[PDB]
Amino acid sequence: DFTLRNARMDDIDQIIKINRLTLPENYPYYFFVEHLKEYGLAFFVAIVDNSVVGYIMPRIEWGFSNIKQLPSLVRKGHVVSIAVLEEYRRKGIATTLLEASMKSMKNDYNAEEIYLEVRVSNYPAIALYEKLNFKKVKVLKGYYADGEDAYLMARPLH
């Protein structure tokens, strides 16, 4: 009962409201637009009833590796943001978004790994990443503004 496709500039508003509704980290419009162009092949939306109800926003970076079994310097895919509207959760959306984005990160921008930051209290997110074989590879102490820690979580791509 849903549909995956690459993000397009007319989704930006839907993407923004979802961001505003779901998350405390509320980037200005131009931030989504810029990533959408730079890394659009790996930028996906989830669609139900011709509405956007979930999105994933990537950045591709180059720098030091997060993971033991990778080389020192690497191309890495950074999940900057991912949200699904509360009404539509547990229906497999965030798993699919991550999978599409990873496949793209790998085959479109040559990522060797994909990492992210997640609040240590965000149990259902942590559960989703571990299920897709992300591992906790660092605890960022007092990472968020309120002072909450994050786990940096990461996973190689071959």
Ligand X SMILES: CC(C)(COP(=O)(O)OP(=O)(O)OC[C@H]1O[C@@H](n2cnc3c(N)ncnc32)[C@H](O)[C@@H]1OP(=O)(O)O)[C@@H](O)C(=O)NCCC(=O)NCCS
Question: Which of 47, 94 has the CB closer to ligand X?
Answer: 94
Is the dihedral angle over the CA atoms 54, 60, 63, 66 positive or is it negative? positive
Question: Which of 70, 152 has the CB closer to ligand X?
Answer: 152
Nearest distance from residue 58's CB to ligand X, in Å? 13
78 annotated ligand-binding residue: yes
Phi, psi of 152 (to 5 degrees): -80, 120
Nearest distance from residue 13's CB to ligand X, in Å? 19
Nearest distance from residue 128's CB to ligand X, in Å? 3
40 annotated ligand-binding residue: no
Question: Which of 69, 136 has the CB closer to ligand X?
Answer: 136
Nearest distance from residue 132's CB to ligand X, in Å? 8
Concatenated DSSP letters of 53-71: EEEEEEEEEEEE-SSTTS-
Question: Which of 17, 62 has the CB closer to ligand X?
Answer: 17
Would you tell me which residues interact with ligand X (CB under 6 A)? 22-23, 82-84, 89-95, 118, 122, 124-125, 127-128, 131
Per the annotation, binding residues for Zn(2+) are 78, 117
